[PDB]
Design a protein around this ligand. Sequence first.
Ligand code: 017
Lengths: 99, 99
Amino acid sequence: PQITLWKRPLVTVKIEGQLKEALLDTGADDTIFEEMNLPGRWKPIIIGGIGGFIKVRQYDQILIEICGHKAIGTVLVGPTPFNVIGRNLLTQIGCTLNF
Amino acid sequence: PQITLWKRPLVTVKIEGQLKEALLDTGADDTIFEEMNLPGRWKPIIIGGIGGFIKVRQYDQILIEICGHKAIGTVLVGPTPFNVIGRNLLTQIGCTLNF
Ligand SMILES: CC(C)CN(C[C@@H](O)[C@H](Cc1ccccc1)NC(=O)O[C@H]1CO[C@H]2OCC[C@H]21)S(=O)(=O)c1ccc(N)cc1
């Protein structure tokens, strides 16, 4: 799908059987979600952005189906204001910017 | 141009005679640059990111020339870690996400 940027690029994702909306965020290197249960071993890390840094849990090789496209990669869990799909997963669905 | 997301989507920008690289950021509603001077009056505002908020100066009707495409709109100036071109200006160059 082609997506214009007049509104936030929020898509519906299926992750761990749960339905969530997330931002397709080209300014995010990695994917991060609100608090939720995910499988496998995790490690506490600390990501930062505009204004400061948060503590999250890094889960590896997590599956997400993003607007009907499947991707596997690292998903971080923690107090993010929005779920964001970052470049680590955007690449896997072959997402590009065009102008 | 078509831009893949394996690397950060940086582009060279010309703004008020200055050359800068800025992140094509589809998760940013607004455009913000590190400290610089700009024409016109400005109003202080607060913006919030993943882990906190920052005090920035808001400028309106600022000319930005992004990768050879021109746009005019709001530009915020504050202690951002990376210059980001938000949707308020991505929309003006006809930028779209495609996958
Ligand atoms: C620090 C920057 C490189 C921006 N980042 C991605 C960006 O899309 C965020 C993602 C984002 C989205 C909503 C809320 C917080 C963060 N948006 C953002 O900070 O924009 C703010 C300035 O313009 C305004 O527009 C909305 C928020 C304001 S980030 O969220 O901090 C980030 C950094 C690393 C990872 N792995 C994931 C996300």
